[PDB]
Design an enzyme around this catalytic site. Structure first.
Site, PDB file in Angstrom:
ATOM      1  NE  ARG A 154      35.650 -90.077 -12.950  1.00 15.13           N
ATOM      2  CZ  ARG A 154      36.625 -90.012 -12.049  1.00 15.13           C
ATOM      3  NH1 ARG A 154      36.345 -90.147 -10.749  1.00 15.13           N
ATOM      4  NH2 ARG A 154      37.870 -89.777 -12.442  1.00 15.13           N
ATOM      5  CG  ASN A 155      35.394 -93.670 -16.427  1.00 13.64           C
ATOM      6  OD1 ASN A 155      34.331 -93.392 -16.975  1.00 13.64           O
ATOM      7  ND2 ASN A 155      36.410 -92.809 -16.352  1.00 13.64           N
ATOM      8  CG  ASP A 175      34.854 -93.155 -20.606  1.00 10.43           C
ATOM      9  OD1 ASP A 175      34.620 -93.346 -21.826  1.00 10.43           O
ATOM     10  OD2 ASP A 175      34.070 -92.525 -19.862  1.00 10.43           O
ATOM     11  CG  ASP A 202      39.271 -90.930 -16.041  1.00 12.42           C
ATOM     12  OD1 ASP A 202      39.389 -90.691 -14.819  1.00 12.42           O
ATOM     13  OD2 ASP A 202      38.372 -90.397 -16.731  1.00 12.42           O
TER      14      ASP A 202
HETATM   15  C1  LIG Z   1      44.185 -81.471 -29.304  1.00 12.07           C
HETATM   16  N1  LIG Z   1      44.251 -82.914 -29.521  1.00 12.07           N
HETATM   17  C2  LIG Z   1      43.478 -83.164 -30.739  1.00 12.07           C
HETATM   18  C3  LIG Z   1      42.443 -84.305 -30.594  1.00 12.07           C
HETATM   19  C4  LIG Z   1      42.927 -85.466 -29.737  1.00 12.07           C
HETATM   20  C5  LIG Z   1      41.934 -86.619 -29.424  1.00 12.07           C
HETATM   21  C6  LIG Z   1      42.307 -87.965 -29.659  1.00 12.07           C
HETATM   22  C7  LIG Z   1      41.435 -89.053 -29.389  1.00 12.07           C
HETATM   23  C8  LIG Z   1      40.113 -88.902 -28.894  1.00 12.07           C
HETATM   24  C9  LIG Z   1      39.295 -90.155 -28.566  1.00 12.07           C
HETATM   25  C10 LIG Z   1      39.382 -91.382 -29.292  1.00 12.07           C
HETATM   26  C11 LIG Z   1      38.667 -92.561 -28.927  1.00 12.07           C
HETATM   27  C12 LIG Z   1      37.866 -92.532 -27.749  1.00 12.07           C
HETATM   28  C13 LIG Z   1      37.794 -91.340 -27.004  1.00 12.07           C
HETATM   29  C14 LIG Z   1      38.514 -90.184 -27.390  1.00 12.07           C
HETATM   30  C15 LIG Z   1      36.879 -91.622 -25.861  1.00 12.07           C
HETATM   31  O1  LIG Z   1      36.514 -90.880 -24.952  1.00 12.07           O
HETATM   32  N2  LIG Z   1      36.402 -92.950 -25.891  1.00 12.07           N
HETATM   33  C16 LIG Z   1      35.568 -93.579 -24.921  1.00 12.07           C
HETATM   34  C17 LIG Z   1      34.078 -93.344 -25.297  1.00 12.07           C
HETATM   35  O2  LIG Z   1      33.805 -93.159 -26.433  1.00 12.07           O
HETATM   36  N3  LIG Z   1      33.168 -93.381 -24.164  1.00 12.07           N
HETATM   37  C18 LIG Z   1      31.775 -93.291 -24.349  1.00 12.07           C
HETATM   38  N4  LIG Z   1      30.758 -93.223 -23.470  1.00 12.07           N
HETATM   39  C19 LIG Z   1      29.473 -93.233 -24.095  1.00 12.07           C
HETATM   40  C20 LIG Z   1      29.502 -93.358 -25.479  1.00 12.07           C
HETATM   41  S1  LIG Z   1      31.138 -93.469 -26.015  1.00 12.07           S
HETATM   42  C21 LIG Z   1      35.834 -95.130 -24.833  1.00 12.07           C
HETATM   43  C22 LIG Z   1      34.864 -96.070 -25.163  1.00 12.07           C
HETATM   44  C23 LIG Z   1      35.105 -97.468 -25.056  1.00 12.07           C
HETATM   45  F1  LIG Z   1      34.134 -98.320 -25.379  1.00 12.07           F
HETATM   46  C24 LIG Z   1      36.369 -97.939 -24.617  1.00 12.07           C
HETATM   47  C25 LIG Z   1      37.374 -97.021 -24.296  1.00 12.07           C
HETATM   48  C26 LIG Z   1      37.094 -95.628 -24.390  1.00 12.07           C
HETATM   49  O3  LIG Z   1      38.031 -94.669 -24.064  1.00 12.07           O
HETATM   50  C27 LIG Z   1      36.993 -93.592 -27.101  1.00 12.07           C
HETATM   51  C28 LIG Z   1      39.770 -87.558 -28.600  1.00 12.07           C
HETATM   52  C29 LIG Z   1      40.635 -86.448 -28.874  1.00 12.07           C
HETATM   53  C30 LIG Z   1      43.207 -84.947 -28.339  1.00 12.07           C
HETATM   54  C31 LIG Z   1      43.791 -83.520 -28.260  1.00 12.07           C
HETATM   55  N1  LIG Z   2      27.727 -96.948 -22.278  1.00 13.68           N
HETATM   56  C1  LIG Z   2      27.062 -96.248 -21.351  1.00 13.68           C
HETATM   57  N2  LIG Z   2      25.789 -96.602 -21.060  1.00 13.68           N
HETATM   58  C2  LIG Z   2      25.113 -95.892 -20.151  1.00 13.68           C
HETATM   59  N3  LIG Z   2      25.523 -94.839 -19.438  1.00 13.68           N
HETATM   60  C3  LIG Z   2      26.789 -94.515 -19.740  1.00 13.68           C
HETATM   61  C4  LIG Z   2      27.605 -95.143 -20.667  1.00 13.68           C
HETATM   62  N4  LIG Z   2      28.854 -94.545 -20.707  1.00 13.68           N
HETATM   63  C5  LIG Z   2      28.757 -93.567 -19.840  1.00 13.68           C
HETATM   64  N5  LIG Z   2      27.540 -93.495 -19.215  1.00 13.68           N
HETATM   65  C6  LIG Z   2      27.133 -92.507 -18.224  1.00 13.68           C
HETATM   66  O1  LIG Z   2      27.080 -91.248 -18.864  1.00 13.68           O
HETATM   67  C7  LIG Z   2      27.477 -90.211 -17.925  1.00 13.68           C
HETATM   68  C8  LIG Z   2      28.605 -89.385 -18.499  1.00 13.68           C
HETATM   69  O2  LIG Z   2      29.809 -90.189 -18.584  1.00 13.68           O
HETATM   70  P1  LIG Z   2      31.227 -89.524 -18.784  1.00 13.68           P
HETATM   71  O3  LIG Z   2      31.060 -88.399 -19.702  1.00 13.68           O
HETATM   72  O4  LIG Z   2      32.277 -90.557 -19.181  1.00 13.68           O
HETATM   73  O5  LIG Z   2      31.642 -88.918 -17.349  1.00 13.68           O
HETATM   74  P2  LIG Z   2      32.257 -89.654 -16.132  1.00 13.68           P
HETATM   75  O6  LIG Z   2      32.338 -91.130 -16.298  1.00 13.68           O
HETATM   76  O7  LIG Z   2      31.326 -89.403 -14.916  1.00 13.68           O
HETATM   77  N6  LIG Z   2      33.734 -88.988 -15.718  1.00 13.68           N
HETATM   78  P3  LIG Z   2      35.051 -89.251 -16.753  1.00 13.68           P
HETATM   79  O8  LIG Z   2      34.702 -90.394 -17.784  1.00 13.68           O
HETATM   80  O9  LIG Z   2      36.204 -89.645 -15.752  1.00 13.68           O
HETATM   81  O10 LIG Z   2      35.349 -88.005 -17.511  1.00 13.68           O
HETATM   82  C9  LIG Z   2      27.809 -90.929 -16.622  1.00 13.68           C
HETATM   83  O11 LIG Z   2      26.644 -90.919 -15.810  1.00 13.68           O
HETATM   84  C10 LIG Z   2      28.136 -92.348 -17.093  1.00 13.68           C
HETATM   85  O12 LIG Z   2      27.863 -93.332 -16.109  1.00 13.68           O
HETATM   86 MG   LIG Z   3      33.338 -91.843 -18.037  1.00 12.97          MG
END
Ligand SMILES: CN1CCC(c2ccc(-c3ccc4c(c3)C(=O)N([C@@H](C(=O)Nc3nccs3)c3cc(F)ccc3O)C4)cc2)CC1
Ligand SMILES: Nc1ncnc2c1ncn2[C@@H]1O[C@H](COP(=O)(O)OP(=O)(O)NP(=O)(O)O)[C@@H](O)[C@H]1O
Ligand SMILES: [Mg+2]
Ligand SMILES: CN1CCC(c2ccc(-c3ccc4c(c3)C(=O)N([C@@H](C(=O)Nc3nccs3)c3cc(F)ccc3O)C4)cc2)CC1
Ligand SMILES: Nc1ncnc2c1ncn2[C@@H]1O[C@H](COP(=O)(O)OP(=O)(O)NP(=O)(O)O)[C@@H](O)[C@H]1O
Ligand SMILES: [Mg+2]
Lengths: 298, 297
Positions: free
Chosen positions: B141-142, B155, B137
């Site tokens: 945006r990521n 992400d 992904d």
């Molecule tokens: C039906 N069957 C059952 C359940 C299965 C499932 C398995 C694993 C996850 C899982 C695990 C770990 C993560 C994510 C998702 C994820 O969305 N994560 C991001 C992340 O947390 N983003 C953020 N934004 C702001 C604060 S946290 C992320 C953060 C980061 F620092 C580096 C990489 C990354 O991907 C981490 C969800 C569902 C899927 C479908």
């Molecule tokens: N660690 C972070 N600190 C601040 N803002 C963040 C952080 N992670 C995500 N955001 C913001 O939070 C919002 C939601 O992020 P997210 O749910 O991952 O959607 P997305 O990046 O726009 N699309 P996708 O991740 O491809 O599903 C966006 O405006 C991101 O830029």
């Molecule tokens: Mg994102």
């Protein structure tokens, strides 16, 4: 070199809340607003109480560039300056505050491992200042900042011009009181007092004795008493830091080694009620703190 | 392992919604260490997905991998809270994502920043390839802005969530047609991401329904040359969108290439006013790092 000290405009930061005051100024929690950006970044701001002139500012700047040049995990770096009618100094904001207040507020939850590791870290920072040929001149528990509970850093060092113009009598070596001699070995004396403050969980040294009488009691051989938690091994280190002959006191390099030895078997050297119920954080908890608040090498 | 902290609900709070994506909602939050009075900012993603013990084991297994990355241009997952809904904790980035940043600074970004960002994203992606982790992904945006001088990929690695929208307009042709995801399809997404930066955040294939994208790619049409790009830069993008995935550049090669261009940025990007644009200075860089960005670069 020069690029290590940021010159700020008044329009790019704001003081928001008073945190406290000391000998030379008032400290604020503030916000830095980078030009052209929308973010507000927390900083600590010290505004000096006395106003200065542009020629005096040349003095301030010369010392500021040195304090902006330190590079050690246990020493705070001066980051920026704003030359207003009263000068404002900018450094990293430490939300945990100073180690003196921290030990007073957490005194019933601090074990021997934290206390001795703090002694090691303060000694490491002081040894770095000595390597840089910088005398602290105001070492005390109030001038050790808590970055996280596991990581402390020394602050407010090197203020020879401010102290000379005027004093922390109860932290000063006898030769500093009597003769205005400040060396790395008089810093060792202040280190001993700082350790005494930590081991007493923040007691006031020579409580109730007027500062004007301290040099007399020191000449008569009186010293700070043995803290209840200290074994004789720890108290002898403290006493050696307060020897009248400055060259007989331990060196910061030696203090690092000795307190590091004690930190490997902390309950042999400090006797604290509740010590087996308190420990250092698990690697999991330390990794979490570091990622959120403390990414520097250390 | 010790790289992923298990949090209880009682030690953190969501404060304000920052936005929502395909799989959850991101909040600005606060962490309160037990026994302490300080409140530490965090970013929290609460997934829409419901949580069963069986799904939670799957989530945890993936989370440990995402908590294990160690590279200055890759965001690390820091913690997790597994209640009725999954909450994921990472460092809060006050500047937000790079897509919004270039949109908001559309008239103030010089060529040095743009090319430096391309270098940094390629360094983060090369690390993921070294770790055998496909992003799946990657898009502007990521990419998060830690400081204006330092961006980080986020992400990545969400194979299980994407395997159960799809970002068609960032995907390689072989991913659209067959859900084949590799490091070489990440290179395609990297190309689109660079195109997003060079256009200051234009939407790719704007106004074209996702269902017709594969038709356009099969005939050889690609995203158009951004006005500021010289042919040397646009050809990198075009090479990232070659049909033969093994013919696309490798991230390791893209690091070298964009690093060479970043050493003479005005030869490779033509931006009006570029000489009055702010450059990353050492004084500003030392100040930013001390206040917001102390990790080893
Ligand atoms: C039906 N069957 C059952 C359940 C299965 C499932 C398995 C694993 C996850 C899982 C695990 C770990 C993560 C994510 C998702 C994820 O969305 N994560 C991001 C992340 O947390 N983003 C953020 N934004 C702001 C604060 S946290 C992320 C953060 C980061 F620092 C580096 C990489 C990354 O991907 C981490 C969800 C569902 C899927 C479908
Ligand atoms: N660690 C972070 N600190 C601040 N803002 C963040 C952080 N992670 C995500 N955001 C913001 O939070 C919002 C939601 O992020 P997210 O749910 O991952 O959607 P997305 O990046 O726009 N699309 P996708 O991740 O491809 O599903 C966006 O405006 C991101 O830029
Ligand atoms: Mg994102
Ligand atoms: C008045 N007449 C005329 C002029 C003369 C004069 C000479 C030098 C200064 C000067 C220069 C530089 C500093 C300081 C003072 C100082 O107080 N400084 C601290 C510091 O900034 N503290 C902080 N707390 C919270 C936020 S900023 C500090 C911060 C740090 F990160 C590391 C070491 C350090 O000393 C730095 C002032 C006056 C004196 C006599
Ligand atoms: N960087 C910082 N972050 C957070 N709090 C700070 C910081 N620097 C200082 N403080 C606090 O601000 C208050 C005022 O500090 P300061 O004015 O240096 O007085 P002091 O340390 O008590 N005495 P002294 O430094 O010996 O003159 C104290 O409570 C400090 O702990
Ligand atoms: Mg102080």
């Amino acid at each position: 070199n020069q690029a290590l000290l940021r010159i700020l405009k008044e329009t790019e930061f704001k003081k928001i809340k008073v945190l406290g005051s000391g000998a030379f100024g008032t400290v604020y929690k503030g916000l830095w607003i980078p030009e052209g950006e929308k973010v507000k970044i927390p900083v600590a701001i010290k505004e000096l109480r006395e106003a200065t002139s542009p020629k005096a500012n040349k003095e301030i700047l010369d010392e500021a560039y040195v304090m902006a040049s330190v590079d050690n995990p246990h020493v705070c770096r001066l980051l920026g300056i704003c030359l207003t009618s009263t000068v404002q100094l900018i450094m990293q904001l430490m939300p945990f505050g100073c180690l003196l207040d921290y030990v007073r507020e957490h005194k019933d939850n601090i074990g021997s491992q934290y206390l001795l590791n703090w002694c090691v870290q303060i000694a490491k920072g002081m040894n770095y200042l000595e390597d840089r040929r910088l005398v602290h001149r105001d070492l005390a528990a109030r001038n050790v900042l808590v970055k996280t509970p596991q990581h402390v850093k020394i602050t407010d060092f090197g203020l020879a011009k401010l102290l000379g113009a005027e004093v922390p009598i109860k932290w000063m070596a006898l030769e500093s009181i009597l003769h205005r001699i400040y060396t790395h070995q008089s810093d060792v004396w202040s280190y001993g007092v700082t350790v005494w403050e930590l081991m007493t969980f923040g007691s006031k040294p020579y409580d109730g004795i007027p500062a004007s009488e301290i040099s007399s009691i020191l000449e008569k051989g009186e010293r700070l008493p043995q803290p209840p938690i200290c074994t004789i091994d720890v108290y002898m280190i403290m006493r050696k830091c307060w020897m009248i002959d400055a060259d007989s006191r331990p060196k910061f390099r030696e203090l690092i080694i000795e307190f590091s030895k004690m930190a490997r078997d902390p309950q042999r050297y400090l006797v604290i009620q509740g010590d087996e119920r308190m420990h250092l954080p698990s690697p999991t908890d330390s990794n979490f703190y570091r990622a959120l608040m403390d990414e520097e090498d250390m």
